[model samples]
Target: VQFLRTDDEVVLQCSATVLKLCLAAEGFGNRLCFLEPTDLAICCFTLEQSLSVRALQEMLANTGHRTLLYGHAILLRHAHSRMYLSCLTTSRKLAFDVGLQEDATGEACWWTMHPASKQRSEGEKVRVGDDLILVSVSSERYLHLSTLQVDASFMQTLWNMNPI
Candidate 1:
């Protein structure tokens, strides 16, 4: 089924990079879900995550560098005892690919502001529209903040879940 962000009880999301890594080491492909409570169910509608990935891909391409996209994070109930134990022993949140295209790769995860929000500083906050943009330049890393207009539909997905 095509993924739509309107679904309910989507505890979390996992990046395609993370999933691929799970498959290589654990021998568990991406299809068979280990439904944990803390999972951010990106399996439903991965549109947004895919876009972020594409953006990263394009950025890397422009720099004459290639990377296998991993580090996709899901937001399901993190406290689920069963899934925690399962995933912990199995993959431990690693990402890889059959391509084996790189000697060193970086991992990045997306986050929301719901947790520990009160601790956020005046200008330091997280939103859906807010992206953690990291660039590996000349063996050094650079981070960029891409903030949209405040009127953007940043947290709509978290605020309004699908009426399932």
Candidate 2:
């Protein structure tokens, strides 16, 4: 499906993983919210980013789109890599672009995950479809969708950033 977001139809990306961490724990802290540090550490290994909850919210607040972030990681690229519902997202994840960016390539480009089951790429890609493209985030962080198309209306809202 395509998002007719702007008069020009801009593509939007988001970061649902950061959404959860950035939002409140709600009613499942000691019970459902029991993600161990080991698991988080594992995600961090290939995790291009781990928005410090607060940072995640600040980002979500500024960047529109409420993503589900079900994917262990978000694959940033063209547009078809991810999809969105009225507001719900099947991928539950968002793509990454450069900070203060609103374009699709260049200083802001595309990338994908290499899968933790295999070896990691040393920022190299010899093929177009190769999943190991170099991400341009400083310190190697993950990029989301909203950074691409800004100043527009989107059905997707951030999960939660900093709730009272």
Candidate 3:
């Protein structure tokens, strides 16, 4: 099992398919795109070569070891935009929409990874390809995909965090 470390370049993959999560630069801001075309695109002040936009870094939000563990608050930071992957909740509804935000000061940006298997416990190191459920720390919702269509060929899936 591969132990995920802090700042490790990682790609977000949908467990059901081969599609990978991506962020495309549109206008002044960036938008979330699934298997669309890119990553967060990190750039330097001197205008150096940009990094892949598909690459993201998993950062531990609270006190923990370098390795990512289950039930620990973590932040998924887009390498290009340096933004945290967030779940947007409407004030009037219980539903959630996943997106990236510039602010990491709020609980919306924090997620606790849970293994699909009930046998796993807290403080256990998360392994690569392990089935996981990302729960929003603030809303306590489970991150799952929706049937929302984006294009003809590719279905636009919404990150729906359903209440347990």
Candidate 4:
């Protein structure tokens, strides 16, 4: 299903309840920004908590099989418990593949503000639609962000998961 926002932007909104469950998994809450739309590539970060990493390893280790995707979905399948992330798309028709949650019971989630919102001081006020843009320069070279697949080794995955 497809959802329509104030900007007339087409999107799929997931329930906060199910999203929270996925956020509880290691590196999820910190890496993925809930403040922004989930379907977009917002951010990624490393897992600093050794305990959490250990727990994550134990959870995946016992799984019969595993599959990963370059989507908004996040999954942690444990023998005792499971958590996943996804939003419904009853209103937006943009077709993209992602893991669907079998159970989602709650209100729809949406980002109603600018993807990057900033408050200005009294003296910093600007006209409506005023905007600022930033570009990364390496004394200057190519710059961009794209998700890609890597090796199957857990240690290799962890190493790749770290921030640049």
Candidate 5:
């Protein structure tokens, strides 16, 4: 099967695993919501991003696409290895330049989870149909979706940093 998203598409060159902790009796404390076929566009904006959930939902609702709720762990490159999504946000906020990031390459850019099972890469891949919104967000800088063309409509919204 094949699918496409955006006039310009972004590749999520990664995989997913079950977020045992996130689905644990005391993990993220919320459920996972998959917004696309298979396991793409897996977002928890409704809760984690409640601040922007309303607008996000409005945009998605227009698509009339129902999603599946499942537990997943997002993974990213971290020094020749991959790490879990939790590791990135456990002690700090996330921000980044997704385009500059490469998987397991000796490049000085961005990093997240660790290798092996402890890694949250254990979750599944979240894609739109077959395409994934692979981008990076940093805790101290702007999110780098350089390769993926995002409109100011929603792009500008994620600029603010709110602490919990």
Candidate 6:
């Protein structure tokens, strides 16, 4: 596995699929969505044309480190929209929703990375394919994927991050 570095382009995946952005219901702006494996046509087209939307930039929260270390806080900024990945706790359901926000001055966009299986030191480098649990700094909830789908194209959960 390769070490995850700051400013690396990455994709967030879950259940073998990747996370993407789709138009919001009101058409105000874009929101988090998922790509189905069966939608290969749109998937391939999206992968080629909208790569920047799916590619997020990994940045250290502290700004003092170049390498992402386990248990360290980090920020994920959408490469295309230039928005920070944030948590939305005001959802009607108990589960929190992950969205992109314009502001990065608050903890809503901060996430702390932890090893999913084994314990790792804070100084240990986060490698690609290493199962990780990202905890929302503001809501204190783990970033999770839900089965709920909106408008057949938009999904309501945030998933795994893979460095690209």
lDDT of 1: 0.23
lDDT of 5 by residue, 82-125 (tens): 21222122211123212212222221222121222332232332
Estimate TM-scores for all models.
0.18, 0.19, 0.63, 0.16, 0.19, 0.66
CA deviation > 4 Å runs, candidate 6: 16-28, 32-65, 149-160
List per-prediction Cα lDDT, in the order shown. Answer: 0.23, 0.23, 0.49, 0.20, 0.22, 0.53
Better of 4 and 6 by TM-score: 6
lDDT of 3 by residue, 5-63 (tens): 56556555443354443322221274443343222253100111111112222222331
**Stronger candidate by lDDT (4 vs 6):** 6
State residue 3's C-alpha deviation in candidate 1, in Å. Answer: 3.0
When summed lDDT is taken over every stretch of 10 residues in candidate 3, the lowest stretch is 44-53
Which regions of candidate 3 fall more than 4 Å away from where they truly are?
17-28, 32-65, 90-94, 149-164
For residues 3-105, could you state the per-residue lDDT of candidate 1 as single tens digits?
A: 2231122222222222311111111233223322222222222112312444545655776111112232222221222121011112211221111111122
Sort by lDDT, top down from the best: 6, 3, 1, 2, 5, 4
lDDT, candidate 4, 21-68, per-residue tens: 111112233212122223122222111111122344464456611222
Cand. 5 Cα-lDDT: 0.22
**Whose TM-score is higher: candidate 2's or candidate 5's?**
2
Model 3, residue pairs in steric clash: 39-53, 39-54, 40-53, 40-80, 41-80, 42-80, 150-156
Q: After superposition, how far is residue 51 of candidate 2 from its true place, in Å?
A: 25
Supply the TM-score for candidate 6.
Answer: 0.66
- What is the per-residue lDDT of model 2 for residues 52-97, given as tens digits with 9 covering 90 to 100? 3345436545753322121212222212212111111112124221
Candidate 2 least-lDDT 10 residues: 23-32
Root-mean-square deviation of each candidate, in angstroms?
16.8, 17.7, 10.1, 18.8, 17.6, 8.7
Top candidate, metric TM-score: 6
